[PDB]
Amino acid sequence: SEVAHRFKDLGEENFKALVLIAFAQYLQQCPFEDHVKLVNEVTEFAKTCVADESAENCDKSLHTLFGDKLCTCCAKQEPERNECFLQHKDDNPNLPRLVRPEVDVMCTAFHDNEETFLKKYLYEIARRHPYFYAPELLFFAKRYKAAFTECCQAADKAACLLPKLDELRDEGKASSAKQRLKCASLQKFGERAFKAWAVARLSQRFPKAEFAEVSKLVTDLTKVHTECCHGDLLECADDRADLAKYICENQDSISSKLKECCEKPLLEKSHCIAEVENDEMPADLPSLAADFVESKDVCKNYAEAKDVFLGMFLYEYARRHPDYSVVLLLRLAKTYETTLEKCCAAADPHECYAKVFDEFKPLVEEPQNLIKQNCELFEQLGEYKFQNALLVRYTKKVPQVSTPTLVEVSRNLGKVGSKCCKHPEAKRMPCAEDYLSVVLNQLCVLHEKTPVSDRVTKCCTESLVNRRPCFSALEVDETYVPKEFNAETFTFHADICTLSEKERQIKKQTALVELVKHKPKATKEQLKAVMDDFAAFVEKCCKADDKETCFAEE
Ligand SMILES: O=S(=O)(O)C(F)(F)C(F)(F)C(F)(F)C(F)(F)C(F)(F)C(F)(F)C(F)(F)C(F)(F)F
Ligand SMILES: O=S(=O)(O)C(F)(F)C(F)(F)C(F)(F)C(F)(F)C(F)(F)C(F)(F)C(F)(F)C(F)(F)F
């Protein structure tokens, strides 16, 4: 009995939560209360299974049960139904932006019913983030609960809560985006791509770890994510705990940076492990040359065990390169692979695969130079203007892309600047390029829902590893027809005056996207000249005797 097994392994609380999450991700549009009803029925049922694993319906898969419950798609049978539920996950669901009500209202609701409030949190995130790393969402719910527990008792409920909630929202969106890439990686590119990812990350993270260890953690982590991305949240959370549990029983085989996370309560622990600092690279590790370029058996060993050897390479290269983005290490490993694929078949492989690392230069240089160039641009512009720059860039690159998406991605793109450009070069590239993988992936998923740009589609369906160079390589499509100057898109409301800094940025940014859409191939100064026109008009209308009409007159 799986639902019992999981209920047992997860405990009711996390079971409930994961089931809610699973429901809210399966039925994003469905009301909270219909989800909790389903969850309770499932939980109630799970309990009957914990008690007798032979009770009538307890041997059914989690898929059948959730899907059966969900069905209270639905016309379909398993496993086509679960596939159906998964494919209907909506990365951009038509759901009201979660509008934070005032703290006292929230704090009242939180105290009115903590679980319901906490379940409401899960539900609202999960349904908005249908790929949200479900166990991680439990961690968020815990922190959300902790926020509300403490901050609701605070003198300044808002001043306590808001920053914390802002942190969790941000962390949430980051985690969602992040997990979204795992699911996209897994689902669009397959297990191997994810495995490659994981070998690269974990090798970087756990360079002291033996390859077999990195592999074991990779197979387990992959299994975690496959399950999570597959809406198998229960297995996923459970396998995650198992993985956290494994890692923590095996820290000395994995990382010396694990001390603190492995002491951490279950949810914190996995979260902690998932983002532990890269471990110290083992001292005096040799170059990959003897094994991967220099050996005469390279061709043989690749061929004998391709993915292992490539994994060993990726492991060996990644563990040596926490200063490389995962995608880079992935690119290098793909390059290695493909070079070996041609060298091994070439007249003298030893000869030509000895040169394999020379192909690595451009691959390594490109992100570096990109990260360096764009981060100077960032340091010149700061996050916001860096966002405006990228927003224009991307709008010009892929103008068909919905502006909200454009804005969101560009903003996020620009956020990598803030996150990464602060870092010295040694931490910039993994930070930047991997966050870039996350953000582009956003662009990718957001756009996929309503594809309107063949370039985005192209760049997103192509090698995940190469997704970023692909967008980077994109230049202005002139095959894009500017949109006529709709007033409504450039006639902001007086609500702009009341907008938070961020929201007024999103708005200028939105205008900036639209303006670029209205008139692409306009240069930065001309774009600046209407952006400044807009902001002035806004400044004017915002301080006008009557705002709403001042605004109307544009
Ligand atoms: O070079 S690639 O990244 O394209 C790659 F071939 F997929 C590879 F990453 F090297 C890889 F070998 F496939 C791998 F990603 F490492 C791997 F598939 F994960 C793997 F290492 F082979 C593995 F599947 F995990 C295995 F090692 F077999 F356990
Ligand atoms: O080259 S692109 O503009 O297409 C890009 F992929 F978005 C990008 F170059 F990575 C970029 F987003 F523009 C970018 F500026 F490089 C970046 F992604 F934001 C970035 F390079 F990561 C950055 F933000 F500049 C970074 F410097 F990495 F922080």
Q: In the chain, what are the domain boundaries?
A: 1-90, 91-180, 188-279, 280-365, 366-477, 478-554
- For the chain, breaks with the C atom over 2.5 A from the next N come after 72
Q: What span, in angstroms and rounded, lies between the C-alpha atoms of 84 and 75?
A: 10
Contacts of 160 (CB under 8 A, 6+ apart): 147, 150, 151, 154
- Amino acid at site 392: V
* Distance of CA 218 from the midpoint of ligand 1 (Å): 10
Q: With contact defined as beta carbons under 8 Å apart, do 334 and 391 qualify?
A: no
Q: How far apart, in whole angstroms, are the C-alpha atoms of residue 145 and residue 126?
A: 16
Q: Can you state the percent helix, strand and coil of the chain, rounding each to 5?
A: 75, 0, 25
Could you tell me which residues come within 8 angstroms of residue 455 by beta carbon, excluding any fewer than 6 positions away? 397, 398, 400, 474, 477
Going by C-alpha positions, the residue among 29, 53, 82 that lies closest to residue 233 is 82
For 184, the token pair is 């996209």
Q: Please name which ligand lies nearest the alpha carbon of 200.
A: 1
Taking the domain 1-90, which CATH number applies? Answer: 1.10.246.10
CA dihedral 43, 44, 50, 53 (to 10 degrees): -110
241 within 8 A of 270, measured Cβ to Cβ? yes
Exposure of 372 by Cβ count < 10 A (0-12 exposed, 13-18 middle, 19+ buried)?
A: middle
3-state secondary structure of 259: coil
**Residue 7: burial class (beta carbons within 10 Å; 0-12, 13-18, 19+):** buried
Q: Which residues contact 105 (CB under 8 A, 6 or more apart)?
A: none
201 in Cβ contact with 221 (< 8 Å): no
CA 420 to ligand 2: nearest atom? 29
CATH class of this structure's domain 91-180: mainly alpha
Tell me whether residue 314 is exposed, middle or buried, using C-beta atoms within 10 angstroms of its C-beta: 0 to 12, 13 to 18, 19 or more.
Answer: buried
The alpha carbon dihedral of 390, 392, 398, 401 has a sign of: positive
Ligand 1 neighbour 465 (Cβ under 6 A): no
Comparing CA positions, the residue from 328, 407, 319, 411 lying closest to residue 371 is: 328
Cα–Cα distance, 255 to 480 (Å, whole number)? 50
CA dist., res. 389 & res. 513, Å (int): 10
Known binding-site residue numbers for Zn(2+): 63, 230, 232
Give the resolution in Å. Answer: 2.3
Residue 464 has phi, psi (to 5 degrees) of -60, -40
From the CA of 201, which ligand is nearest?
1
Cα 413 to averaged position of ligand 2 atoms, centre (Å)? 6
91-180 and 478-554 have identical folds: yes
DSSP secondary structure letters along 408-463: HHHHHHHHHIIIIITS-HHHHHHHHHHHHHHHHHHHHHHHHHS---HHHHHHHHS-
Chain-centroid distance, C-alpha 190: 16
The alpha carbon of 399 is separated from its chain's Cα centroid by a whole number of angstroms, namely 23
In sequence order, the 6+-apart residues with CB closer than 8 A to the CB of 353 are 293, 298, 299, 339, 340, 343, 344
Q: Are 194 and 226 in contact (CB under 8 A)?
A: yes
Question: Among 182, 186, 189, 192, which is best to mutate for testing ligand 1, by the most ligand atoms less than 8 A from CB?
Answer: 192
- For CA atoms 223, 228, 231, 236, the dihedral sign is positive
Phi-psi region of 521 (alpha: psi -120 to 50; beta: other; left: phi over 0): left
CATH tag for 188-279 (out of 3.40.50.300, 2.60.40.10, 1.10.246.10, 3.40.50.720): 1.10.246.10
d(C-alpha 408, C-alpha 128), whole Å: 15
Structural biology method used: X-ray
CB 318 within 8 A of CB 218: no
- How far is Cα 535 from Cα 244, in angstroms, rounded to an integer? 50
Q: Cα dist. 137→94, 134, 144, 271 in Å?
A: 21, 5, 10, 10
How far is ligand 1, taken at its centre, from the CA of residue 333, in Å?
9
Buried b (16+ CB within 10 A) or exposed e, 502-532: eebbbbbbbbbbbbbbbebebeeeebeebbe
Using the mean position of ligand 2's atoms as its centre, give its distance from the Cα of residue 415 in Å: 10
- CA 20 to centroid of chain Cα atoms: 21
Q: What is the 3-state secondary structure (H, E, C) of 83-119?
A: HHHHHCCCCCCCCCCCCCCCHHHHHHHHHHCHHHHHH
CATH fold group of domain 478-554: Serum Albumin; Chain A, Domain 1 (1.10.246)
Paired tokens of 365: 């240089």
**Centre of ligand 1 from the C-alpha of residue 347, in Å:** 26
Q: What is the DSSP letter of 490?
A: G
Question: Quick one: which atom of ligand 2 is closest to the CA of 419?
Answer: 29
Rounded Cα distance between 181 and 437, Å, is: 7
**Substitution candidate for ligand 1 out of 220, 225, 307, 326 with most atoms within 8 A of CB:** 307
8 A C-beta contact, residue 494 and residue 542: yes
At the top level of CATH, the class of 280-365 is: mainly alpha
Give the atom of ligand 2 at the shortest distance from the alpha carbon of 418.
Answer: 29
Q: Can you read off the two tokens belonging to residue 42?
A: 């499932």
Question: Hey, what are 112's tokens?
Answer: 């009115």
Q: Which residues are annotated binding-site positions for Ca(2+)?
A: 2, 9, 227, 232, 235, 238, 242
Q: Which CATH architecture has domain 366-477?
A: Orthogonal Bundle (1.10)
Q: Report how far ligand 1's centroid is from the alpha carbon of 193 (Å).
A: 7
